Scaffold this active site. Sequence first.
Site, mmCIF file in Angstrom:
data_model
loop_
_atom_site.group_PDB
_atom_site.id
_atom_site.type_symbol
_atom_site.label_atom_id
_atom_site.label_comp_id
_atom_site.label_asym_id
_atom_site.label_seq_id
_atom_site.Cartn_x
_atom_site.Cartn_y
_atom_site.Cartn_z
ATOM 1 C CB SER A 58 -1.345 -0.285 1.071
ATOM 2 O OG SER A 58 -1.874 0.913 0.832
ATOM 3 C CD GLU A 76 -5.436 -4.343 -2.804
ATOM 4 O OE1 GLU A 76 -5.478 -3.969 -2.209
ATOM 5 O OE2 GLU A 76 -4.580 -5.178 -2.860
ATOM 6 C CG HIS A 104 -5.579 -2.916 1.755
ATOM 7 N ND1 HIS A 104 -4.944 -3.067 0.211
ATOM 8 C CD2 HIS A 104 -5.166 -2.476 2.462
ATOM 9 C CE1 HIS A 104 -4.034 -1.655 0.746
ATOM 10 N NE2 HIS A 104 -4.247 -1.722 2.045
#
EC number: 3.1.1.8
Lengths: 527, 527, 527
Positions: free
Chosen positions: A196, A323, A436
């Site tokens: 990320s 995600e 995610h």
Amino acid sequence: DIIIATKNGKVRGMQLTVFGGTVTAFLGIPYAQPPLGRLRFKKPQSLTKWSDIWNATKYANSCCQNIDQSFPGFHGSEMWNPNTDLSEDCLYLNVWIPAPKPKNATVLIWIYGGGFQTGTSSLHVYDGKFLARVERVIVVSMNYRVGALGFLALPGNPEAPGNMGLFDQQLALQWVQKNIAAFGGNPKSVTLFGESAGAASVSLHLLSPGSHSLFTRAILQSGSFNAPWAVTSLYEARNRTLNLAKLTGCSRENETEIIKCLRNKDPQEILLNEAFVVPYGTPLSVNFGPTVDGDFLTDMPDILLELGQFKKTQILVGVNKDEGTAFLVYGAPGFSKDNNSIITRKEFQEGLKIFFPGVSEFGKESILFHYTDWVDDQRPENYREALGDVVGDYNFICPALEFTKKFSEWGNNAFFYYFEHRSSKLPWPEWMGVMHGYEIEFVFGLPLERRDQYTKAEEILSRSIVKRWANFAKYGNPQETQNQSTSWPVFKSTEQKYLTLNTESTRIMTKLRAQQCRFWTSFFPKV
Amino acid sequence: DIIIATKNGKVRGMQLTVFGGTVTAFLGIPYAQPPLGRLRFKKPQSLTKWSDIWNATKYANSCCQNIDQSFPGFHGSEMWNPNTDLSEDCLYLNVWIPAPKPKNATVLIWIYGGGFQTGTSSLHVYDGKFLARVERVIVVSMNYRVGALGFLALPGNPEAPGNMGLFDQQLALQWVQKNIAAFGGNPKSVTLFGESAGAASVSLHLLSPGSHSLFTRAILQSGSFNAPWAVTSLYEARNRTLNLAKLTGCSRENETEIIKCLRNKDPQEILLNEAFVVPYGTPLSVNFGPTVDGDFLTDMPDILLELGQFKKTQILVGVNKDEGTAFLVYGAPGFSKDNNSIITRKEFQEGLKIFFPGVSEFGKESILFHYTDWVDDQRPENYREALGDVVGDYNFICPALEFTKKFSEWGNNAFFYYFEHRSSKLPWPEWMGVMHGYEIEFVFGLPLERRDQYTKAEEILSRSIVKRWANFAKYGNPQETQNQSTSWPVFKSTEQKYLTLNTESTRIMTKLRAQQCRFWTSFFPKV
Amino acid sequence: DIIIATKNGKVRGMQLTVFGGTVTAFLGIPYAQPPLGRLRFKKPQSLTKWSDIWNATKYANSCCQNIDQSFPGFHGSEMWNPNTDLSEDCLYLNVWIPAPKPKNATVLIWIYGGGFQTGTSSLHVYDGKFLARVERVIVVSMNYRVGALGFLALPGNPEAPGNMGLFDQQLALQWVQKNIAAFGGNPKSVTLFGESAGAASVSLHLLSPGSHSLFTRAILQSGSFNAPWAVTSLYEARNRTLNLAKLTGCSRENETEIIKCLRNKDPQEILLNEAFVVPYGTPLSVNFGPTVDGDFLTDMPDILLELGQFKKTQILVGVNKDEGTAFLVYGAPGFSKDNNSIITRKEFQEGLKIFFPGVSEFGKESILFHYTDWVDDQRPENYREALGDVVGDYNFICPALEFTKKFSEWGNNAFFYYFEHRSSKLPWPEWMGVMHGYEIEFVFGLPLERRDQYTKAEEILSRSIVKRWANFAKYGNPQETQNQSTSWPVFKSTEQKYLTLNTESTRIMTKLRAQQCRFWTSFFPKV
Ligand SMILES: *[C@@H]1O[C@H](CO[C@H]2O[C@@H](C)[C@@H](O)[C@@H](O)[C@@H]2O)[C@@H](O[C@@H]2O[C@H](CO)[C@@H](O)[C@H](O)[C@H]2NC(C)=O)[C@H](O)[C@H]1NC(C)=O
Ligand SMILES: *[C@@H]1O[C@H](CO[C@H]2O[C@@H](C)[C@@H](O)[C@@H](O)[C@@H]2O)[C@@H](O[C@@H]2O[C@H](CO)[C@@H](O)[C@H](O)[C@H]2NC(C)=O)[C@H](O)[C@H]1NC(C)=O
Ligand SMILES: *[C@@H]1O[C@H](CO[C@H]2O[C@@H](C)[C@@H](O)[C@@H](O)[C@@H]2O)[C@@H](O[C@@H]2O[C@H](CO)[C@@H](O)[C@H](O)[C@H]2NC(C)=O)[C@H](O)[C@H]1NC(C)=O
Ligand SMILES: *[C@H]1O[C@H](CO[C@H]2O[C@@H](C)[C@@H](O)[C@@H](O)[C@@H]2O)[C@@H](O[C@@H]2O[C@H](CO)[C@@H](O)[C@H](O)[C@H]2NC(C)=O)[C@H](O)[C@H]1NC(C)=O
Ligand SMILES: *[C@H]1O[C@H](CO[C@H]2O[C@@H](C)[C@@H](O)[C@@H](O)[C@@H]2O)[C@@H](O[C@@H]2O[C@H](CO)[C@@H](O)[C@H](O)[C@H]2NC(C)=O)[C@H](O)[C@H]1NC(C)=O
Ligand SMILES: *[C@H]1O[C@H](CO[C@H]2O[C@@H](C)[C@@H](O)[C@@H](O)[C@@H]2O)[C@@H](O[C@@H]2O[C@H](CO)[C@@H](O)[C@H](O)[C@H]2NC(C)=O)[C@H](O)[C@H]1NC(C)=O
Ligand SMILES: *[C@@H]1O[C@H](CO)[C@@H](O)[C@H](O)[C@H]1NC(C)=O
Ligand SMILES: *[C@@H]1O[C@H](CO)[C@@H](O)[C@H](O)[C@H]1NC(C)=O
Ligand SMILES: *[C@@H]1O[C@H](CO)[C@@H](O)[C@H](O)[C@H]1NC(C)=O
Ligand SMILES: *[C@@H]1O[C@H](CO)[C@@H](O)[C@H](O)[C@H]1NC(C)=O
Ligand SMILES: *[C@@H]1O[C@H](CO)[C@@H](O)[C@H](O)[C@H]1NC(C)=O
Ligand SMILES: *[C@@H]1O[C@H](CO)[C@@H](O)[C@H](O)[C@H]1NC(C)=O
Ligand SMILES: *[C@@H]1O[C@H](CO)[C@@H](O)[C@H](O)[C@H]1NC(C)=O
Ligand SMILES: *[C@@H]1O[C@H](CO)[C@@H](O)[C@H](O)[C@H]1NC(C)=O
Ligand SMILES: *[C@@H]1O[C@H](CO)[C@@H](O)[C@H](O)[C@H]1NC(C)=O
Ligand SMILES: *[C@@H]1O[C@H](CO)[C@@H](O)[C@H](O)[C@H]1NC(C)=O
Ligand SMILES: *[C@@H]1O[C@H](CO)[C@@H](O)[C@H](O)[C@H]1NC(C)=O
Ligand SMILES: *[C@@H]1O[C@H](CO)[C@@H](O)[C@H](O)[C@H]1NC(C)=O
Ligand SMILES: [Cl-]
Ligand SMILES: [Cl-]
Ligand SMILES: [Cl-]
Ligand SMILES: [Cl-]
Ligand SMILES: [Cl-]
Ligand SMILES: [Cl-]
Ligand SMILES: [K+]
Ligand code: NA
Ligand code: NA
Ligand code: NA
């Protein structure tokens, strides 16, 4: 007793038993002057030297940051909160090395994500002792400043120039170049990896000329700097620094005076006001992040990427199947981690207003048009799934694919993966799927520990991912060569081959999210 | 009187008359500290310097080793036994140079085979004076430690780290880099050549980063490190070192103490117990050989080969037509060098149990299935021939071909030969054909000596091979350009051209043992 | 007064008026110790330094050599005889530079031919003042030792190692590398050019590792080292040195003693015996020439050429239409420069015995078969022309074409010309056509002098050749770009394009002498 002589003085590590072997961990080595008092908001200054032995036998302070209190007592969110004391004095790094000490080992440097607002290197899921034990690599990770304290910008003013936390990362890379050989590492074989905002950070090191000689290659898990949350324009950055001054009583006519007044505030007053420097935010808001400062970043990064102005090397990039779902429970109406979150069309619409607040009515209708032409039964979950896909395609997957296309057009090998395994221990509900952040523990080898009740199929999956990542770092090629594995092909423009990662069977597929990405990449930026 | 000043002191050589000319031989120059007492099982330590003149006028001690006593009085086996005294003090090398002293001659460095358990540089068939005389190259050869004394491993413990005999070879290469110009040699033009374990050793120098700047190119005669006998896993290596301790009274709780007790044993007690560290062996057993030590060899060599992590240079690789026959008389039932060894199906079956002892019933039936579908008459010798081919294809030919394919896929020129001439003087019986080891004397030019009763056709064959090998060392291209010879084409994946070497006519052929190698390379490893 | 400071001391040159401008000539600068007394037959030793000003204002001594007395009083042969005193003290060179002194001019270094037995740099047709004036290049030429004094060889004995005259050339190249910048020249832009043995010499500098860094590119006019007269085998060289000893009373048992006795002979006794060291020679005999000495030349040059072991650079190579005719009047029966030399078949046959004396009856019949199948009338001159073509194809044209093919197959640009203009002033008779040696005066620009009664068409031809040669030296590309000239294409294997040079029209043609060269190149060497 393991003592290593570094360029700044001696450090003492500790021995860990890992899978019938030993790993030496040096936790909490300082790599910069503590950025306190007059150093707050400046670039990190280099360390002076200690005489005596620095005891690197526990994780150091995490940097000041707001914490996620949306689900107190809940492991799914609490596992990402910081697990050491918060302090402005937080510029430290960790080194894990194999025992016996290796001769010239490849080095993996992890950069955590957290929106550039949160995160720390000491979380359990970033523990580098399994990779050191199993693959005989050295793993390094650093704390870097986050939020306004890391990223406040009055662009061109060296009192608050912006990008301080990226400069913290860079100084830790310099520290490895100068010191890692004393630990048995090879400074000429250093791979960055991050997830990320940690992945966006890694992609900006590919663009920054001062990082160019500090690493060899790069791994980007769920993030890249062309993602819409990753880089703040000069105009919103000055706006936000000025709003922060307003809210803390620090508005002044002279800009250097604004900074000096901000340096007198206690950290807590700064943290309390960060949420509010923006008139509306979303679950994905990055209020203080990377900017074009003319130093770390010399031009808008989309221009550098487009015109090939970046380090020429191999990359490994990928994303997880779901995600966007983690973000829906932080404000989209009708969603809850404690029920199946079936929403209506009206809820879906309100949900787009939550995630696309500055966007025109036409823009939001264009999203709905593109994602709600259903195939096909009147399934109750249609709108719940569409919202997770909107948020995950826009913010993570299409930008990772565009980054990989544009990078690979300049002649380097790139390898793309799609991670589609949901952990058997995941504490979030089934409808959130392969979320995610939940590939990380497979990358760091946590399912290799049989005592932890992952399945056997997950042990094998993690073992194969760990081998591919170590082969990529060591050799630039993320193959698993010994176990009749699917061969991972390079990702090229034209064919766009990627490899699926799952417990069942690995497949080579092409053109991930083709129709969706054409929407986000070629149409939506116009809106 | 020829005296040469080396970096460690002066050495005196001797003059030899060879074919109406002179060659200067310096036999037995030391290249390391004798590895005695506390140095036993450690890496070789470099030499200190002598004042005075070292007389290099006779071959030095061969390293300690068991000897082949299966056929006392028989030249065919005795010619491979050591012909100087056995001693732990055996780290010496030989240099042959043309007279008059050359100006910048190419250097050929020979590495003998012997399973990593036996061998010495002083055998008659490795005498480098013919190559020096005829091709005006310098020839160098070294003794290196073999058996447990060369290859005992407690991996990661510098008291017995493994690969000591490969490090002995490497230190002798360093010795040539630093000293060969004083002899008239060019350190920038050094080709390694070796046969069987000497060839596997050469292939591991292509993989080892510390050997990379010590030579230019490489010749592999009947061997490569992917052969199934060439590299010991970490697990069997620790097992074997621990069995050796058990059998010698040296089992201890502390590993460094095991080594210290092994250092107190007389060499003979160590040699006597080497055969037994394994629960069953075969005629091809390598009980103490190369391992993955994290030093000489940084990773499993099949991974390095597959992912292109090796020195990029030209190679010359080849095998003999009947590689496996020599081994059948060292234990397969029904075989004898003194009769035609016609065996039955039952004998063939027992023979597979001798050569594939840890292998499943299914695995052994798969061998029999693949090699006994006959073309076609009921020939008595069907099973005798099939066994020699099983053993030669599995252990030598398919692994040399796979090594050459994989090496050449990374862009370098490779040249493959198939040697098919049986020496007119061979003392073994006709059914053994073109045996393993019996190209060596053609390579070193022994049939150029008319006094020795090889045929005229063998003189011409050896003269042509000697020229091709010298052209390969000097120019990277093993052509014989002056005598309307067949042009030797590069070996590529896809076409797989090789050159046959024989007294009659040289042919370009393709895809040597294609159907057999598909069996050993793609199926058998699964079993 | 022009005085230049060289590394060995000052030299004074002289001013010449050339075409309304000035050129500065420094004639006769020494570049080595005079090779007298104990230095006779050794490699040239470098110069010590003079204090004071060396006057380089006249050509120096030519090296000792036999002279052509076949046509006393006749310009056609006398123009090639030496025009300064003969002396063992003859190691000097000449430098012509433009006035005003240039800044970093390209340098052309001329190497004269003469069979390696004769020649000197001071002939009128090698006068470099026209090239310096018109193209503003610096021209350098050297005297080098010829005959036994230059090329006697007892191979490997440093008292007479062979190739001394090639080492004289090399030392003069070293002299230009170290000193030419003081004259205004660029040592990084040096092109060698030479004709016949001077061209063969240039081709051997492409092969010699010690010449590699002494020049940039090369021009070969009528010669190359693969020509059959250019390189002496080791066996005939030792034979010839031993015959020379026999004829001078110098036969000894110790070889160094033979040399010392040869060093006591007056030069004349050596010169008188050179013709006789061979049992029969021809008009093209090179009794003392280049050999494989293991120093200048490390291996047989046909091997180096074939396997690509030579300097990688551009070359310009060519030949004249009637190369072989000059040689016919030095012994073929029936030929005379003073009549039309119509010969019979019997004469043609006797003529082959004169030019191919060691060759079998079959070999000589093969020549006759290939050259006498006539197209077609019974022309009286059939046999006269066939003999000139035999001698020119075998000795010059086919070897220049094979050299250019083999050189260009390793990837460098080569340009081939066929010179077909007969000088209007040529003093030899018409039947000899475009003779060997008679392009030289066009290359050096002698027809640019209007006072000399060449035609206007010859002035223009020479001006265009001079420009192409200077463009090749300066830029690696022998174009004439300003005057709508035919573009000169690179010579490649496959197409074999060459450019014809004549006063009428320049043509691009292909595959010069294809059918003849297949005979000399692929068949005749077998005979
Ligand atoms: C799933 O839950 C959401 C979230 O809100 C709730 O959390 C539940 C598990 C329960 O404890 C509930 O009391 C709590 O409010 C539900 O949406 C909410 O619905 C309420 C009541 O109707 C609305 O007035 C709220 O505004 C709305 N909250 C939010 C944040 O949107 C949702 O309906 C429920 N969905 C199901 C059961 O399918
Ligand atoms: C070829 O010889 C083998 C080897 O054994 C023998 O060596 C012979 C030359 C001879 O001296 C013989 O006495 C000696 O034993 C023969 O195989 C052996 O056969 C024996 C007797 O039948 C068996 O009982 C043995 O176990 C077996 N030995 C081994 C090692 O297998 C073989 O039969 C013979 N083959 C022929 C003649 O074709
Ligand atoms: C062309 O001349 C040759 C060469 O010989 C001669 O030179 C002439 C110009 C003339 O002065 C002549 O007297 C002198 O000998 C002739 O060949 C010679 O012919 C003679 C006489 O018949 C022979 O006996 C010779 O051996 C031969 N000499 C040689 C070297 O071969 C030749 O015939 C003549 N050709 C013509 C006129 O076409
Ligand atoms: C940046 O500049 C102003 C800042 O306005 C803000 O005052 C700050 C101290 C802070 O509290 C912040 O929440 C507040 O919004 C922005 O002006 C906003 O624009 C809206 C309309 O959207 C108006 O209602 C107000 O002026 C103000 N907002 C609120 C909620 O009162 C301006 O939008 C921003 N610049 C950007 C987004 O580029
Ligand atoms: C390595 O470990 C043991 C070692 O057992 C051995 O004891 C040694 C000192 C030596 O004498 C050796 O010959 C002996 O085998 C191996 O155990 C063997 O396994 C077999 C079954 O195959 C059992 O019968 C015994 O425990 C033992 N063998 C014998 C003949 O007694 C073990 O096999 C080995 N590890 C490997 C091959 O990976
Ligand atoms: C080189 O060795 C001998 C040398 O013989 C020669 O004696 C010299 C001193 C000199 O005068 C030279 O002219 C003379 O030839 C060569 O032997 C010759 O071979 C011929 C047959 O062709 C015999 O007749 C003689 O032994 C001798 N020639 C003559 C004319 O008397 C030998 O040929 C040579 N080696 C070569 C060419 O490789
Ligand atoms: C560092 O480590 C050891 C603990 O084993 C201790 O002797 C030393 O004082 C330590 N330094 C500290 C606690 O500051
Ligand atoms: C580590 O390997 C590099 C190449 O990646 C080399 O340049 C360096 O010197 C090595 N150092 C060692 C083995 O100590
Ligand atoms: C504003 O104040 C700072 C802080 O002392 C001072 O150094 C600076 O010169 C002033 N700048 C301007 C633009 O007035
Ligand atoms: C390969 O397979 C073996 C056993 O068949 C297994 O134990 C190991 O985990 C696998 N290795 C990798 C790198 O996936
Ligand atoms: C070395 O060689 C000579 C033998 O010719 C001798 O004088 C000298 O002593 C020798 N050294 C020895 C035998 O140690
Ligand atoms: C030997 O040749 C090499 C190139 O292979 C060159 O660099 C070196 O200097 C040479 N030394 C000599 C001729 O002495
Ligand atoms: C075992 O003994 C050695 C030999 O003296 C000693 O140096 C070492 O510290 C001890 N190691 C362990 C692991 O007990
Ligand atoms: C080439 O042939 C010659 C004679 O025809 C022979 O004497 C020599 O041995 C051959 N050379 C090679 C290198 O095979
Ligand atoms: C060199 O040149 C001049 C002639 O102009 C003269 O003065 C000097 O003596 C000369 N050196 C000689 C002739 O040695
Ligand atoms: C001459 O040009 C070369 C390149 O051909 C350059 O390296 C050199 O320095 C130049 N010297 C001058 C202009 O004086
Ligand atoms: C021959 O004589 C030379 C000349 O003095 C001498 O130096 C040399 O050692 C002797 N050589 C032989 C081989 O007898
Ligand atoms: C080109 O042509 C001009 C005039 O038309 C002429 O004077 C000159 O000689 C020519 N140049 C060359 C380089 O051939
Ligand atoms: Cl609607
Ligand atoms: Cl597709
Ligand atoms: Cl059966
Ligand atoms: Cl084929
Ligand atoms: Cl006839
Ligand atoms: Cl054509
Ligand atoms: K023929
Ligand atoms: Na909490
Ligand atoms: Na014996
Ligand atoms: Na004269």
